[PDB]
Amino acid sequence: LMSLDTALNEMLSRVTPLTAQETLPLVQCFGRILASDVVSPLDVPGFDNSAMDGYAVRLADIASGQPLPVAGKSFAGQPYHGEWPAGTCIRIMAGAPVPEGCEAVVMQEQTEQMDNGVRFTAEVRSGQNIRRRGEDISAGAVVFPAGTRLTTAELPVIASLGIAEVPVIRKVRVALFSTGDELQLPGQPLGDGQIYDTNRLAVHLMLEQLGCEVINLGIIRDDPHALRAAFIEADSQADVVISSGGVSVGEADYTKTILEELGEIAFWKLAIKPGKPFAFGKLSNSWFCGLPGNPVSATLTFYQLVQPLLAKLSGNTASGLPARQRVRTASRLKKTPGRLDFQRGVLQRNADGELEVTTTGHQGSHIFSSFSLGNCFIVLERDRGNVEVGEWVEVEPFNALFG
Amino acid sequence: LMSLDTALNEMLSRVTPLTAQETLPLVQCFGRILASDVVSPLDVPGFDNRRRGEDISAGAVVFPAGTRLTTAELPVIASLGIAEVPVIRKVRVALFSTGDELQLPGQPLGDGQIYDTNRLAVHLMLEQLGCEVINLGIIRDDPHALRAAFIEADSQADVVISSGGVSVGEADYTKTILEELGEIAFWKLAIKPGKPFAFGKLSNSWFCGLPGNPVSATLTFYQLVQPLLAKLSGNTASGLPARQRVRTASRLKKTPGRLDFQRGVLQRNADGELEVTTTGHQGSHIFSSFSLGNCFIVLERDRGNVEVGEWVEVEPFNALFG
């Protein structure tokens, strides 16, 4: 019934980003959200210098058209403190400090050499091939805004400004559990209708690579007091509490009355496949997300719903839903209208060199092998139906969590 | 001179993957290379409905060794009851730089002194690639410091990296130290940004020497060092991080002779097709390219000046940059 776009936008609308912070040294900030605009304590370049390798020159001691010799030499790791008589043209590496009061630099190519000087093989216009102090970064400027996620792009650049640490938002904590006497841990033996608990691992794994703090509480026993106490424990320590399956996502039962008793939580029916059901709302101190028991469903549900929610909570100001490009079906695809279909395909380069998807196989939620063989999602539009080879189709790539 | 493709194949060819292993519970395996084919202890479906074993039949190999394990696979193994699997040990990479010109942060810039950045960047990439980093810091400008470092490093590492400082061709005391502890080539690569790269075998590890310039070093690492670590790690995932074809929404000055790795910004156009746009000045004197950008533009080597509308090769950035 409810639209995905609709459900998402309602979830994130109520959410207030964390602002609690902590200062860490640069080598620990990867994936961390900056909390306070990094401000340049210095100018970059710090000094005035030459973009190119050749000869610094003034237009006063050049006009004559006398090939001037060199008085001295500047280097990037070896500056210059000489004189420069009234007729010289100092040599200098690229990046190396321009002599006090130089008005232009000229690279070897625009000059001939001899036993008396450096005949400048072309004209020379002021400011040429001088990189200026602060031209790349001026002191007191903002280099990276708050809410920026730090990677190898930014952190080394902060290292270039002598800043050994920056404040970042604290990691989001996420409590996790599942429930069902039916659920067993590995190494234990499958009893009657008993099955091995898998959503919890998947979710747990996804949280950690999302840079969250996981509080994995295990399987909870099929007992109200056991569950009531799991929520309470989880709520006091988390920003977000996830049920990876077991707890009601709509169906009536003791777990459903426990949710109602501890929080105001919506139970939606979302117009998507795989999946459909989703529990969401506020507990006393955290947000609750409840996934359905089906592996393929809960993954998808989490990746598309819970994942967005965590981004906003985390203080990241990176707006957008993982890039999503248009491409052709090299396969046929049975789509049933009425539901936004997140099918998996395989994005690859074709004979020509253009990208094209291929289905992975049976798109049923009764096998997980899709996520492995696949390397993207094929977002067939809600009212769309069977797709024929050749058509233009919406395709979202897999992020790190898979590939 | 030397060809990237060439230099790449010549490095991977000499590398023998790690085979040493450890057994870890599923929750700690993310990113880790599986060391032994995961075999199904049971039938899936275990019961019957769509009957027992039609998806996964017992004795059947679910995942081959050399597979990197993510949310795709590890949940599937938890379905078979397996609480832990063997993976190859993390790749130990020892790291340092050298040059008195290098200062540490919080201290003041001396004369020609500058802040050591390559080491940070390299240390960062390594950890996210899931290596084990032995960061030995800044080495003093002394041949004995340097000698002592390579030894210390070689004895803990499968791979030793100098993020800068140690010669990559130019003749000086550190160059002679390399010839003394190892058989290391000094290449000059047909690429931009950059060019110089040192590579070889110490007594007990491979050495990779990046050049001083930040833009050069990051790129050289990403394009040479990174592949090298994947093979070493025992990953059997073959390929050059996906590289698709797309149009320049922008002009791009490209000189022939060198394979140019410029950065642009891949994005959805009005219609709905992917197109690229340059970041700005493609000089190596600034590092803002890796932030604004979100891919590389691999200008074919002999290619020169591109014009708007042309088909151009584009390799998106991985998680190392977003």
UniProtKB/Swiss-Prot annotation, chain A:
Cofactor binding comment, as recorded: Binds 1 Mg(2+) ion per subunit.
Record CDD domains: MoeA (cd00887)
Gene Ontology, cellular component aspect: cytoplasm; cytosol
Record-listed E.C. numbers: 2.10.1.1
GO biological process annotation, one example: Mo-molybdopterin cofactor biosynthetic process
First-tier enzyme category under EC: transferase
Main function: Catalyzes the insertion of molybdate into adenylated molybdopterin with the concomitant release of AMP.
Protein's name in the database: Molybdopterin molybdenumtransferase
Curated annotation (Swiss-Prot), chain B:
Gene Ontology molecular function: any one: molybdopterin molybdotransferase activity
Keyword annotations: Magnesium, Metal-binding, Molybdenum, Molybdenum cofactor biosynthesis, Transferase
Gene3D superfamilies: MoaB/Mog-like domain, MoeA, C-terminal, domain IV, Molybdopterin biosynthesis moea protein, domain 2, Molybdopterin biosynthesis moea protein, domain 3
GO BP, sorted A to Z: Mo-molybdopterin cofactor biosynthetic process
Organism: Escherichia coli (strain K12)
Signal peptide as annotated in the record: none
EC numbers for this chain: 2.10.1.1
Highest rank taxon of the organism: Bacteria
NCBIfam families: Glp_gephyrin, molyb_syn, PRK10680.1
InterPro entries: MoaB/Mog-like_dom_sf, MoaB/Mog_dom, MoCF_biosynth_CS, MoeA-like, MoeA_C_domain_IV, MoeA_C_domain_IV_sf, MoeA_linker/N, MoeA_linker/N_sf
UniProt feature coiled coil, ranges: none
Pathway: Cofactor biosynthesis; molybdopterin biosynthesis
Protein name as catalogued: Molybdopterin molybdenumtransferase
Keyword Ligase: no
